[PDB]
Amino acid sequence: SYYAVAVVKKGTDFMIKDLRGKTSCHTGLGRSAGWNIPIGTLIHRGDIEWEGIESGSVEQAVAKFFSASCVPGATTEQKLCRQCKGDAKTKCLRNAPYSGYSGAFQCLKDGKGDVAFVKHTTVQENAPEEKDEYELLCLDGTRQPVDSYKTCNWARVAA
Ligand SMILES: [Fe+3]
């Protein structure tokens, strides 16, 4: 099992209720911490307006919420590929540079997103000496340190 977390930089100040219009980094379309949990969570909060497949695709609803994102594997909305790093033609593929837990974290690090949807070991694995420059967005409207994932995660995931 792992925990799904939302990583942000200590320089910013927005909370979970303020995500509309920000830029986002995801591990890839359809993955647990990078898509299913965060998108699902926002739909239920009522922040992302989707009521059912008859109100469009999930992709279109997300592209209207974030100003732009990198979502490796996205199929219909080019806005979901706009922050992706790489060659014009392969940047948004499932195995592209900002794909995966590492690649999504690197997208936040390089300033291409305001938030990365990754898992609880991600920051320690990829930036152990810079852990203090990041924090997590909690469901209750606060921020907590990276090592506080147990009390600041969006869900526990089966894997
Ligand atoms: Fe995963």
Curated annotation (Swiss-Prot):
It is found in: Secreted. Disulfide bonds join C25-C107, C70-C84, C81-C92, C138-C152. Transferrins are iron binding transport proteins which can bind two Fe(3+) ions in association with the binding of an anion, usually bicarbonate. It is responsible for the transport of iron from sites of absorption and heme degradation to those of storage and utilization. Serum transferrin may also have a further role in stimulating cell proliferation. Belongs to the transferrin family. Monomer. This is Ovotransferrin. The lineage of its organism: Eukaryota, Metazoa, Chordata, Craniata, Vertebrata.
